[PDB]
Amino acid sequence: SEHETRLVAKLFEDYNSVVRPVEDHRQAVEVTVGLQLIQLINVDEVNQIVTTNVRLKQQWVDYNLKWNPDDYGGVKKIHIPSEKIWRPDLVLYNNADGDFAIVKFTKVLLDYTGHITWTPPAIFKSYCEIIVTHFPFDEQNCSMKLGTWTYDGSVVVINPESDQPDLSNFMESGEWVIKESRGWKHWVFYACCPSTPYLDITYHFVMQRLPLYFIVNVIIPCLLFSFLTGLVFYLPTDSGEKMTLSISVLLSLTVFLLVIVELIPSTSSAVPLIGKYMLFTMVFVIASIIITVIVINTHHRSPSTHVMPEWVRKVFIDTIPNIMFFSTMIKHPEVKSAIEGIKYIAETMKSDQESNNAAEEWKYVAMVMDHILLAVFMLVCIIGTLAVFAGRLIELNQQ
Amino acid sequence: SEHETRLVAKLFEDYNSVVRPVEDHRQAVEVTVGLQLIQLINVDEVNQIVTTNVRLKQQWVDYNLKWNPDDYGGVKKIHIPSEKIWRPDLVLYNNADGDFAIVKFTKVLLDYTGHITWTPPAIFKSYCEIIVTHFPFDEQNCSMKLGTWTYDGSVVVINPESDQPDLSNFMESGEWVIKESRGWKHWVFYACCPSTPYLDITYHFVMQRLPLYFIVNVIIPCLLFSFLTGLVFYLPTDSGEKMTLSISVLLSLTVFLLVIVELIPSTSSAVPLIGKYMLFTMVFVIASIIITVIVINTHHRSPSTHVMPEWVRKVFIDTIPNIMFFSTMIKHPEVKSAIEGIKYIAETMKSDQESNNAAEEWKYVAMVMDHILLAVFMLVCIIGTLAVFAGRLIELNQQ
Amino acid sequence: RNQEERLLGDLMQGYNPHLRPAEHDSDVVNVSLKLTLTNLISLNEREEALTTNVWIEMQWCDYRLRWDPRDYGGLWVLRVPSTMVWRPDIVLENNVDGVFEVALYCNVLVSPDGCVYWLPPAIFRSSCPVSVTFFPFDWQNCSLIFQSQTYSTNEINLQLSQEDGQTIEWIFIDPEAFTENGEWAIRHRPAKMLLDEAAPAEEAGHQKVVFYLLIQRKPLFYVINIIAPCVLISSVAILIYFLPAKAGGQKCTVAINVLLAQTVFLFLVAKKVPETSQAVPLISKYLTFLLVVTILIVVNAVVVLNVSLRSPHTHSMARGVRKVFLRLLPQLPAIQACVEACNLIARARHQQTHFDSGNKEWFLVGRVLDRVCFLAMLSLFVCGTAGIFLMAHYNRVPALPFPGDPRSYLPSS
Amino acid sequence: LNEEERLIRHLFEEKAYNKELRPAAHKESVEISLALTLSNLISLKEVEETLTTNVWIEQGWTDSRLQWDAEDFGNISVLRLPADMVWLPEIVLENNNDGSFQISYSCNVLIYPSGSVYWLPPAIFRSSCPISVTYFPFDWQNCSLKFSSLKYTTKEITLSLKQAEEDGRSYPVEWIIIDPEGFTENGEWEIVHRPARVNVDPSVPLDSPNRQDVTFYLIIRRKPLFYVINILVPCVLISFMINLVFYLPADCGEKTSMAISVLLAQSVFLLLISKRLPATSMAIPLIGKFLLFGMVLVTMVVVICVIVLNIHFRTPSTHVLSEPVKKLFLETLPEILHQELFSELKPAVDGANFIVNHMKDQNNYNEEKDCWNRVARTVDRLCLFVVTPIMVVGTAWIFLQGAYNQPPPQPFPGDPFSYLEKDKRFI
Amino acid sequence: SEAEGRLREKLFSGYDSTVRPAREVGDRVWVSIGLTLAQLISLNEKDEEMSTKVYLDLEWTDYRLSWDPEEHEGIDSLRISAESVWLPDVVLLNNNDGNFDVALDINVVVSSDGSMRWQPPGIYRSSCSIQVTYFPFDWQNCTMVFSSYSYDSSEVSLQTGLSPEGQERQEVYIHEGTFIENGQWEIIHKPSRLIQPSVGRREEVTFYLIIRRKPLFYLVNVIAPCILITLLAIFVFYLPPDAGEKMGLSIFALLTLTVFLLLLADKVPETSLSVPIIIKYLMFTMVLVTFSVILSVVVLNLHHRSPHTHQMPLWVRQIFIHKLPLYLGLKRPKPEPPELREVVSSISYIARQLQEQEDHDVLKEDWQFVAMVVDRLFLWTFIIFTSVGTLVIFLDATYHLPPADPFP
């Protein structure tokens, strides 16, 4: 276009992009700022960094970039490079692992009235404090503080375009759901510049994690392994396999604890819900191991080496009927040698019978102890799992 | 300063940075090159790349950048952007995943005599071949070959600033200690340019690893499991736990081998001695498992199924104890039916006692074999432990 | 912007940003430096790198950028791009990633008396040699060293910033910008200006400004998620002394499995500590101690099983049975065939009874051995745990930022 | 003044050099000679399928605008210039997978009085190398570096290989140059063939810049000692212990536990080996095939151990030992594989008879138990002699497929030329 | 050539590369966009990002860059640096890494009539929403949206680039001679569609790639080991209770399955809109092995019931000794002077003791036979459940096929 070529040559013959685009230096540049969240790329909990793809729409009037369309064949809007004009220097205060300002300098749309629209893209890696208290059912409020760096409120005034970020082009995430989003303008006095206030717009997004992945891949195996903890008390002591069950469960929960520990920040501000559950089932399994060792010791207590205490007999055999499908428990010297041998055999079987019967008393004590402990541990499993998860679950189902 | 402005205007009016800065094109530019190692960032062994922070001090003289200080207010030195002047094109020949040449163009100190000093920083990721033979007690020699790329020795002569690289500003590394460092100048004839020699300075650094981390995290657990191997032969066969011990120790040695695999490059120039040790203990445990299977099979041979060989009764019953010490081991139908039944009982128990005696002989053979194998395997474990490690350890302690 | 444009045109005529603001040669340009920590992003212990978000305030005065506000309609400040003015090439010397300069080259704020105020933001990754001796109950002394990459002491004077009569010898922390790290608490934050008196006065980087961060780890995560699991799973190893010394007792299964668990914990701990070799971590030494305790538990379980399952026909020892009983108290014509068969039956039962008695004696010997060794290993475990944890507990941060310096380097108020 | 300064002022100011114009007539093509010197084969990442190589790319052409008479300029016979001051053919690596088309360091060009421009920039190129996994760790790979111009077509430039001279006879350099003074050997990969070709595709149109290219191929063979020592030997030795369960007794010996532990070890090996190779579907790795075969064999042996334990723990009160099974598994297979005296004494005689009958019943029970145990042992020995040959044969077959794999004798099948320096083709 | 230099000087006299070539106000610049896939580098499911190497094919007209070849020595085409001419601001809108522009700056081919052809290379990383339900037997529909970043539809209008075959070709071009197929993905369909906005976005050209995974790696490395471990879990019920190895087999099979799940977690997508079918299979197998552990504990409990303490309920006797064994084919083998005075007393005591032991053994054998019947019933039940569940899951996976039509 020859008209637009002449216009662009005329507008930038004596243009200065250093100075603010005002007729008088005493007035401020009014800027309208609007964030458009295109995609929520990542929420790194370990490093506490939120990666978002955004478009930072900025609108402002330039005094020296006006023209009459009648003088230029009716041209009313043009597209010009942004690097050649004055721009607001909008900086993300809470940047963590990225660029502080815009680095992609896309074209600006310039109207004949001096109005400039500049909508650059950006990949903001902002800092979000990650609260782990309800992980993997946690809610995270992550903010983005955008403000002019070197221009105070007296020389450049930024205004929000809308009360909320623009989510009309937001690609839905497979891990997070944005519950609420809101942009607030703040006037802040900094110690570096105590005279004038500096303006900022903080855009915050409340995000609810979708917990299906962590439920399937972490929680369900842990529930399966914790359910097998109490079943050690239904195993007989004569099988010689109680320790196998308990120890394998303990090792599996140890591996899963490593997996969960690799998934959360090392901050000390809160203990995660899943970590609390893991420690609970670990103490549960170790208690099961201790009382299983006690049960095995009681079962194998040799009656010759151990006398039955009368209090144990009262507590376990006499007391505790509950369901009692149990029972509760001439004249040759050769002839003389035969008499002595037969008597010795009979007395030996007498002694063996009494020793065996005392052994079964010990085994019966162990059996009833196992039957009480099975019910106790099975109930404790459900009670602990509910007491951990159900509070957050009913909170989410009730909100 | 106004005089400095006048000077810098005077120096760069007809200056050409393309031209070599000498009075005559037939003479060479004399460049003094010195390397200052600031920090050994990394010695990546798997990728065989050494990352270092360095300062590459280059000094020369520019013929066309001289001035009289009396004519410019007594200015004897100035600072000039390095991009405005001719520079030597030093390149790191053995670049692996970095920049061949200097990319950060700091300023140059220029004297009134034309002397230029330029000290750019660099992050050099060079190629060090990793001799894995004595890992983790290993010593690595890494070179840095620096030379002018396009200028042969007849047009640009590089000279080392000193024999040794400058380690005055070196931050000491926690994993490596530099024992020796030296720079050597070389006149190399390349196939691309047969007629002229190209100069290079190769700065080499000998480094000795500090092995405490690998001693604590790898060697000590592995030694503990190697010691755990030997106790299977002192464990009785009546406990039913020999195989569990053996295969568990084996599994642990597998996971240690496949992490030490991850900690070492996959080159075939040499096999690490830690890998030799792990293969040695793997074969040791596997021989232990095979021999334990033989012992277990021997412990339950019975006269009903196996007859005692004469050589076994010659060796393991009388010859082995010589080196060891043990115990070296009115008639009526009903009436006559009762008498014959008592005869049957007596014969049955006598036969059972004979069978038990033969079984006990087999158990005693298993017991003496277990003692011999306990001694042999403990001694073999100690000998293999010392033989692998004693060489490098005494070499380093004598060093 | 008529007055701003007029002033920028007037000031930038003949201005060379590559030349120092020395009105007369041999003059030294005073550069005031202040640091404001906005967020301590991380301390990567493996790479030994401290990532910090900072605002680095640099102040100096350019005699070439002076103007009278009355000549320019009362304009008393000008925002100029930082590339068009001269700057001191202040860089972080101890950077790890090769990034020497600030991130964003924002505008400078020039004042009528010529004094330039630059306050860029930066994400600096400095080199912090991590001391691991008391991990996770450790504190680290990281440093940020700032110096001019170009100019020497005779050319610029790099000083700390001064408030109204007071020198700001500390990292500033604005409450309106600071965010607390969830893992690290800043205990001391001094600042110093270091000028080696005997160094050359012609080389550039010899006057430095060092900002130190003494940071204490918050160890709640590591105690809850790593240490207490390890302690309890090691206590499980102690329980094998109560299991019976027979088949089905399952001593070795328990002991070797808890050994595998402790090795897994050692693997987990090794991931979170550097590969340096200045010292062994506290938690690593505790893990090695627990491993050795479990190995000795396995050794004694094997010995106890061997003693308990010793056959009477194999061998006997009169001294061994005596010593345990000493310690047990502190611990607490058809008739001819008929009679021949009857005698054989009785003698067989006698032999069975004697064999059973010998087995019972061996069983008691094994039980006594297990009981005596239980208390010794419990004492070893408890003493080692208590000693290591007290050593952890007594690793407090020093009271003062610098040993030998009575000063606290904290702001007045 | 410097003759270099005079010459630059002559070539670039007096004659007004324009780097945007080709050094040729409009309907004439510039001949670009290309060679490649491999300084270091940095890596071949199989999972990412990327070859990282350090290479000096030698480009040569003639620029008649940059010629001078050496006599008029103090017998100056060479000049170093920035590469951005002259027209360049702009040769790029088309096979890059990271997006870095251009050389790394844009060094100077050397120009001679005849007008010949010579450029030798270094580069670290990351090219796409599809990987064959069928014989890992005994595999060989065929990577290629394809160089072409995206700015110019065959009408505008003509790519060709560098020509060298021997005793006055000119030949083309049809191989990757390996300078002994600038080459470092890779510890894992040895170069078997290193040819170089000029490819012209007649299918694509003449106006396409992709019609012509120069391809430098690297056929490389892995050195398998690392994987043989560290991976294959442990896994094979662990796998072959599954035969040992057949020697373990059926009462004390934990046959099933040992066998499933071998299975767990094989699973760990397989899963950790799958991470060292890409997830392609062209073929299964040799080691992967071996581990799958071993896992299936271990599963069969565990099932066999379950059946043997089932047979061993049989009793008269549960199963009847049929005479056919008895004869088959205890005789046939083991052979090939290798008046007071009435009334007052009635209590005594009755008790004696009952005791005797109880003892006889117990003895018969015990003999039946022993017969079941021997049947189980015979089954164990038969399964040993059936399973161990199968495992040995399969292992030997798989690893002989592995060992006998070698690269082709020639770089290109169907082309007899060896692409070696000794066989240089003078023309 | 000097003629080329003079022509270039003539064309770029008073030419502004930042001004759109609109001869009249209100004129549209028609841009034709085509794509050529050189390599499908990867589809990373964890990052949900498709990495590709492509050659764009952008065609338009610049009326300011036309000339008469007869007046310029027959020069009818020029290859000009792409920064010296106006370019459409065409960008990959749906990029994932923040990189919008092309990979290399190359020449634009300008014809004497002003026709501009630009074929830049580009290494792109676009966003792809991974449908995880049938992974690894899944097909993905990954899109590449190309649009002008700045110019609106009234200024620059897009259209699909026709191949030399013409006919308004709507497809990604792949040169079968040089294209190397990805080893993990097969391109089923590859259309191209001009999406025009409703009545606020602008016109875009979307290139779709329907790509089907080749699941041989996951079949070999994951599915078959899981089938083997499940088959092993079946045979715990054929193991005797007297061997004392049921717990070890079942629990360590569960541990192996857990190991497989954890070491498969590095490959599966990490979204939460669905569950992969392979993860469903692993969870089913883990639950089945857990139930096998539970019922093995039950069987071991039944086998070791002390006869003197536990009296068998009569209903247990009827169901598990009389009724079920006939149905399960588990027939029980059984169809069902002073010295002399003292010696007589002793012998009577021996006979009574052996009688009592016989009764105890009978009750113990009855309990063990009940445990055995329960074990066989559970063996058959687990065979049925395993086979049915595996068949259902495998038929659900195998019958998931890529579409026959790109745009239903």
Curated annotation (Swiss-Prot), chains A, B:
- Where on the tree of life does the source sit, at the highest rank? Eukaryota
Q: Name its cellular compartments.
A: Postsynaptic cell membrane; Cell membrane
What is any one GO biological process for this UniProt entry? neuromuscular synaptic transmission
Chemical reaction(s) catalysed: K(+)(in) = K(+)(out); Na(+)(in) = Na(+)(out)
Stretches that traverse the bilayer: 211-235, 243-261, 277-296, 372-390
Q: What is its main location?
A: membrane
Glycosylation site residues: N141
Q: Which Pfam families does the record cross-reference, listed alphabetically?
A: Neur_chan_LBD, Neur_chan_memb
Any one GO cellular component localisation term in the record? acetylcholine-gated channel complex
Q: Which cysteines are joined by disulfide bonds?
A: C128-C142, C192-C193
Q: Gene3D superfamilies from the entry?
A: Neurotransmitter-gated ion-channel ligand-binding domain, Neurotransmitter-gated ion-channel transmembrane domain
Q: Does the keyword Transferase apply?
A: no
Query: Which parts of the sequence lie on the Extracellular side of the lipid bilayer?
Result: 1-210
Write the record's keywords in alphabetical order, separated by commas.
Answer: Cell membrane, Disulfide bond, Glycoprotein, Ion channel, Ion transport, Ligand-gated ion channel, Membrane, Postsynaptic cell membrane, Receptor, Signal, Synapse, Transmembrane, Transmembrane helix, Transport
Topology, Cytoplasmic side: 297-371
Family membership, please give it: Belongs to the ligand-gated ion channel (TC 1.A.9) family. Acetylcholine receptor (TC 1.A.9.1) subfamily. Alpha-1/CHRNA1 sub-subfamily.
Assembly, in brief, is:
One of the alpha chains that assemble within the acetylcholine receptor, a pentamer of two alpha chains, a beta, a delta, and a gamma (in immature muscle) or epsilon (in mature muscle) chains. The muscle heteropentamer composed of alpha-1, beta-1, delta, epsilon subunits interacts with the alpha-conotoxin ImII.
Q: What the protein does?
A: Upon acetylcholine binding, the AChR responds by an extensive change in conformation that affects all subunits and leads to opening of an ion-conducting channel across the plasma membrane.
- What is the originating organism of this protein? Bos taurus
What is the gene called?
CHRNA1
From Swiss-Prot, chain C:
Where is this chain glycosylated? N30, N141
What keywords is this UniProt entry annotated with? Answer: Cell membrane, Disulfide bond, Glycoprotein, Ion channel, Ion transport, Ligand-gated ion channel, Membrane, Postsynaptic cell membrane, Receptor, Signal, Synapse, Transmembrane, Transmembrane helix, Transport
Reactions listed under catalytic activity:
K(+)(in) = K(+)(out); Na(+)(in) = Na(+)(out)
How does this protein sit in the membrane? Multi-pass membrane protein
Query: Which compartment or compartments is the protein found in?
Result: Postsynaptic cell membrane; Cell membrane
Q: Which residues lie on this side of the membrane: Extracellular?
A: 1-218
Q: Which GO terms describe its biological process?
A: acetylcholine receptor signaling pathway; chemical synaptic transmission; membrane depolarization; monoatomic ion transmembrane transport
**Lipoprotein found in the keyword field:** no
Gene Ontology MF term list? acetylcholine receptor activity; acetylcholine-gated monoatomic cation-selective channel activity; transmitter-gated monoatomic ion channel activity involved in regulation of postsynaptic membrane potential
What Pfam family is a match, any one? Neur_chan_memb
Q: Spell out where the chain crosses the membrane.
A: 219-243, 252-270, 286-307, 372-392
**The keyword Cytoplasm is annotated on this UniProt entry:** no
Listed as disulfide-bonded, the cysteine pairs are: C128-C142
Highest taxon in the source lineage: Eukaryota
Q: One GO term of the cellular component aspect?
A: postsynaptic membrane
Functional summary from the UniProt entry:
After binding acetylcholine, the AChR responds by an extensive change in conformation that affects all subunits and leads to opening of an ion-conducting channel across the plasma membrane.
Q: Which family does it belong to?
A: Belongs to the ligand-gated ion channel (TC 1.A.9) family. Acetylcholine receptor (TC 1.A.9.1) subfamily. Gamma/CHRNG sub-subfamily.
- Subunit structure, per the record? Pentamer of two alpha chains, and one each of the beta, delta, and gamma (in immature muscle) or epsilon (in mature muscle) chains.
Give the organism, scientific name: Bos taurus (Bovine)
Q: Which gene name does the record give?
A: CHRNG
UniProtKB/Swiss-Prot annotation, chain D:
Family matches, as SUPFAM superfamilies: Neurotransmitter-gated ion-channel transmembrane pore (SSF90112), Nicotinic receptor ligand binding domain-like (SSF63712)
This protein's record includes keyword Signal: yes
The cysteines covalently paired via disulfide bonds are C129-C143
Looking at the keywords, is RNA-binding present?
no
* A UniProt-annotated Pfam family: Neur_chan_memb
Show the CDD domains listed in the entry.
LGIC_TM_nAChR
Indicate how the chain sits in the lipid bilayer. Multi-pass membrane protein
Mind telling me which residue stretches traverse the membrane in this protein?
224-248, 258-275, 290-311, 382-404
GO cellular component terms, alphabetically, are:
acetylcholine-gated channel complex; neuromuscular junction; neuron projection; plasma membrane; postsynaptic specialization membrane; synapse
PROSITE patterns hit by this protein: NEUROTR_ION_CHANNEL
Q: Which reaction does it catalyse?
A: K(+)(in) = K(+)(out); Na(+)(in) = Na(+)(out)
Q: Which residues lie on this side of the membrane: Extracellular?
A: 1-223
Q: Which residues are glycosylated?
A: N75, N142
Q: Which UniProt keywords apply?
A: Cell membrane, Disulfide bond, Glycoprotein, Ion channel, Ion transport, Ligand-gated ion channel, Membrane, Phosphoprotein, Postsynaptic cell membrane, Receptor, Signal, Synapse, Transmembrane, Transmembrane helix, Transport
Q: What is the top-level taxon of the source organism?
A: Eukaryota
Which GO molecular function entries does the Swiss-Prot or TrEMBL record give? acetylcholine binding; acetylcholine receptor activity; acetylcholine-gated monoatomic cation-selective channel activity; excitatory extracellular ligand-gated monoatomic ion channel activity; transmitter-gated monoatomic ion channel activity involved in regulation of postsynaptic membrane potential
Q: Which GO terms describe its biological process?
A: acetylcholine receptor signaling pathway; chemical synaptic transmission; membrane depolarization; monoatomic ion transmembrane transport; musculoskeletal movement; skeletal muscle tissue growth
As for subcellular location, the record says: Postsynaptic cell membrane; Cell membrane
Q: Which residues form a coiled coil?
A: none
Species this chain originates from: Bos taurus (Bovine)
Curated annotation (Swiss-Prot), chain E:
From the record, give the transmembrane residue ranges: 215-239, 247-264, 281-302, 377-395
Query: What is one process in the GO biological process aspect for this record?
Result: membrane depolarization
Which catalytic reaction applies to this protein? K(+)(in) = K(+)(out); Na(+)(in) = Na(+)(out)
Task: Note the SUPFAM superfamilies from the entry.
Answer: Neurotransmitter-gated ion-channel transmembrane pore, Nicotinic receptor ligand binding domain-like
State which residues carry a glycan (glycosylated): N141
InterPro entries with a match to the protein in the record: Neur_chan_lig-bd (IPR006202), Neur_chan_lig-bd_sf (IPR036734), Neur_channel (IPR006201), Neuro-gated_channel_TM_sf (IPR036719), Neuro_actylchol_rec (IPR038050), Neurotrans-gated_channel_TM (IPR006029), Neurotransmitter_ion_chnl_CS (IPR018000), Nicotinic_acetylcholine_rcpt (IPR002394)
Q: Which PROSITE patterns does the record associate with it?
A: NEUROTR_ION_CHANNEL
Annotated Gene Ontology MF terms? acetylcholine receptor activity; acetylcholine-gated monoatomic cation-selective channel activity; channel activity; excitatory extracellular ligand-gated monoatomic ion channel activity; transmitter-gated monoatomic ion channel activity involved in regulation of postsynaptic membrane potential
Location within or outside the cell: Postsynaptic cell membrane; Cell membrane
Per the record's keyword annotation, is Transmembrane helix included, yes or no?
Answer: yes
For this UniProt record, the keywords arranged alphabetically read as follows: Cell membrane, Disulfide bond, Glycoprotein, Ion channel, Ion transport, Ligand-gated ion channel, Membrane, Phosphoprotein, Postsynaptic cell membrane, Receptor, Signal, Synapse, Transmembrane, Transmembrane helix, Transport
Name the protein family. Answer: Belongs to the ligand-gated ion channel (TC 1.A.9) family. Acetylcholine receptor (TC 1.A.9.1) subfamily. Beta-1/CHRNB1 sub-subfamily.
Q: This chain belongs to which protein, by name?
A: Acetylcholine receptor subunit beta
